[PDB]
Every structure is written in C-alpha cells, then in structure tokens.
Amino acid sequence: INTNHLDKQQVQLLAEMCILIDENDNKIGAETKKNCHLNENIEKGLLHRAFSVFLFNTENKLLLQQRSDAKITFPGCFTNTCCSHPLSNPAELEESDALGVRRAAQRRLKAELGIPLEEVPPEEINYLTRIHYKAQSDGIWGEHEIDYILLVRMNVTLNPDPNEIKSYCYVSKEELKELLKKAASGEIKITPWFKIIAATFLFKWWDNLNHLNQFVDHEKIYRM
Ligand SMILES: [Mg+2]
Ligand SMILES: [Mg+2]
Ligand SMILES: [Mn+2]
Numbered sequence: 001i002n003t004n005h006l007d008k009q010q011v012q013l014l015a016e017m018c019i020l021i022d023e024n025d026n027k028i029g030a031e032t033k034k035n036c037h038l039n040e041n042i043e044k045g046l047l048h049r050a051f052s053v054f055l056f057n058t059e060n061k062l063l064l065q066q067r068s069d070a071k072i073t074f075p076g077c078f079t080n081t082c083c084s085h086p087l088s089n090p091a092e093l094e095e096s097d098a099l100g101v102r103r104a105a106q107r108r109l110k111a112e113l114g115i116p117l118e119e120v121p122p123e124e125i126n127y128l129t130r131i132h133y134k135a136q137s138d139g140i141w142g143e144h145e146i147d148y149i150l151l152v153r154m155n156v157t158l159n160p161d162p163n164e165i166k167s168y169c170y171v172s173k174e175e176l177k178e179l180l181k182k183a184a185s186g187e188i189k190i191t192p193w194f195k196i197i198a199a200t201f202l203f204k205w206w207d208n209l210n211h212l213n214q215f216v217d218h219e220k221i222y223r224m
Contacts, residue, residue: 001140003034007070009163014072017088019049025130025146025221030088037073039136042144048085050145051101052193053109053125054202055081055152060209061170063156064179065112067191068166073137076166078179079191081152084108085145098127098218101148113168114159126151128205129217133224135192146221147193149201153209173206196224 003011014034022028027049035041036048055063063081067074086092086104094100102122109115128149136142160168171179180198183190190198200222205215 003072006072007163010070010072016085018085019088019093021047021049021146023047023132023146023221025049027093033085036085037141037143039140039142042134042142047144047146049101049148050085050143051083051105051148051150052080052197053082053105053150053152054197054205055109055120055154055156056206056209057170058153058155059170060206061172062176062206063168063170064176065160065168066166068162068164070163073141073143074189074191077189077191077194078183079194080197082109082112083147083191083193084112098148102127102150105150109156112161112164113156114161115156119156120152120154124152124154126212126216127218128212128215129201129220129222131193131196131222131224133193133196143193145193149197151205151209151212173203200224 016033017030018033018036019027020029020031036046064078067077067079069075086101092100092104102125105125106117106120106122109120110117128151130146130148132146134144182188
C-alpha cells in the first residue's frame with residue numbers, strides 16, 4: 001500500500017534493511033523496515049531486532065524525546081532517549097558482545113539527536129537485557145521486536161533533527177512519574193514499549209545506576 005500521505009524523509013528510511021529473527025533472537029533473514037512494520041506482515045509472524053537507549057546525564061536525569069508528527073509509527077509520543085533497529089549490514093549484524101546493536105545506537109543517537117559519535121562510543125553503552133513485545137500504532141502500522149535495552153550515563157551536546165523529534169527534556173524520577181500520570185489520564189501519549197519498561201524495569205535501574213550489574217541478563221528474553 002501507499003505511503004503517499006506520509007513524510008518523505010521518513011519514507012526513504014523505509015527502505016532500510018532490518019534483521020529478521022526467530023523468537024530466540026537468532027538471525028533468520030533481512031527485510032525492509034516498511035515490511036517489518038506492517039501489521040499484515042507481523043500477523044504472518046514477522047519479528048525484527050531492535051534497541052532502546054535510556055540516557056541519563058550526571059544529575060541522573062533521564063533524557064526523554066517526543067517523536068515528531070512525521071514518524072510513521074507512534075507520532076507525537078513521549079518515549080525514552082532513542083530507539084531504532086540494527087541494520088542488516090556486517091557492521092551492525094555483529095553479535096560478538098552485542099557490538100552490532102551498540103554501533104546502531106551510536107549511529108542513531110547521532111542521527112536523531114545530533115550527539116557526536118565521539119561522545120557515546122560503543123563501550124559507553126551498557127546492554128542490560130532484551131524484551132519481546134508486540135504493539136499496534138494504528139490499523140496498518142505496528143511493532144514486533146526483541147528489543148535490546150541500552151543504558152548510557154553521559155553529559156551530551158544536543159542538536160536533534162526536528163524531522164525525528166518534536167521536543168526533548170531531561171526528567172528526574174519524580175518528573176517522570178508526573179509525566180506517566182498525564183499519559184495514564186490521556187493528556188499526553190507515550191509509546192507502548194516505554195510504558196512496558198517504565199512499569200517494569202526502569203525505576204529499579206534508576207535507583208541503582210552505580211550498580212547496574214545485578215540487572216545484566218544476556219540470557220533471558222523477557223516476554224511482554
Ligand atoms: Mg527512533
Ligand atoms: Mg565477531
Ligand atoms: Mn521496529
């Protein structure tokens with residue numbers, strides 16, 4: 001179907017090749033971003049690899065973004081720092097130490113937020129665990145991913161792309177709770193994966209930013 005009612009820069013990105021995985025995060029093929037995000041294809045079992053970054057500054061504030069109205073899935077939605085997909089190329093397919101996803105994150109942090117690659121090298125990105133989830137944006141578009149959860153603690157310089165991001169802000173624990181109450185009462189919108197992680201893992205990790213190890217689980221894929 002017909003992507004003419006949609007933003008041109010976003011549409012171009014639909015040609016990007018994502019990693020098709022089985023339910024255990026083993027690579028099984030490669031498919032365009034567009035096909036990976038059609039509900040019709042997700043209903044046929046299509047599942048791709050993804051990542052979510054949560055970036056805290058040195059005041060321990062979480063950087064949140066609001067997705068531009070240009071985004072094809074979940075526009076206008078408040079969400080964690082940066083999400084995307086590792087590309088089906090040899091740089092980002094690399095599975096040794098989840099290096100391919102961490103490289104993908106660094107790349108998207110630069111593309112979405114204008115964060116210089118040097119400010120967040122792949123070593124500064126802490127891969128915690130993975131979550132499997134399925135969620136619809138509308139009738140046509142949706143998500144089905146095993147999402148790599150990445151944490152960064154870094155003071156960064158921002159110049160975000162207005163095509164990707166409507167607004168952004170750093171929040172304290174209490175300010176996010178306040179924001180999550182506005183979401184629950186329909187005053188703003190949040191993405192389904194951010195709701196999932198906020199309800200389940202986020203505040204536990206947040207309380208323990210110095211000791212993130214007890215949370216590192218590279219074996220278990222959490223099913224939400
Ligand atoms: Mg994104
Ligand atoms: Mg290797
Ligand atoms: Mn996706």
